[PDB]
Amino acid sequence: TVSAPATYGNFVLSPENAVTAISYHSILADFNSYKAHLTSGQPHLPNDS
Amino acid sequence: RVASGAGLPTSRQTTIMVTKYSEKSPITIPFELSAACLTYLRETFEGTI
Numbered sequence: 001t002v003s004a005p006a007t008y009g010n011f012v013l014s015p016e017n018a019v020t021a022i023s024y025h026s027i028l029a030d031f032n033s034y035k036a037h038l039t040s041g042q043p044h045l046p047n048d049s
Numbered sequence: 050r051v052a053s054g055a056g057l058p059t060s061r062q063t064t065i066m067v068t069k070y071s072e073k074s075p076i077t078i079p080f081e082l083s084a085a086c087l088t089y090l091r092e093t094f095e096g097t098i
Contacts, residue, residue, distance in 0.1 A: 018098045 011049070 013021075016031040028034065029049035037045065050060040 013098050015098050 013027070014031055017027045020031065021027055030045075033045065037043075050062055053059045
């Protein structure tokens with residue numbers, strides 16, 4: 001009896017992503033997370049979205 | 050009409066009638082909307098930032 005997932009995942013866009021999608025035609029996942037990690041100097045991310 | 054003197058022909062009174070007429074001159078300005086603009090006005094897709 002495999003315990004397979006029951007539902008599709010979902011990947012909402014960030015309100016910060018809406019700006020770089022318009023001015024730069026580009027989206028770097030979790031733009032709010034990279035700002036905090038570069039502020040904190042921490043090199044590693046727990047997960048890549 | 051001024052009253053005349055002896056031996057000079059008198060002046061008959063003259064009613065005058067006249068009429069003005071109106072003139073037409075209409076105006077027009079075109080303004081256009083791209084269908085891509087209208088389609089976001091009325092249709093609305095998955096509501097995303």
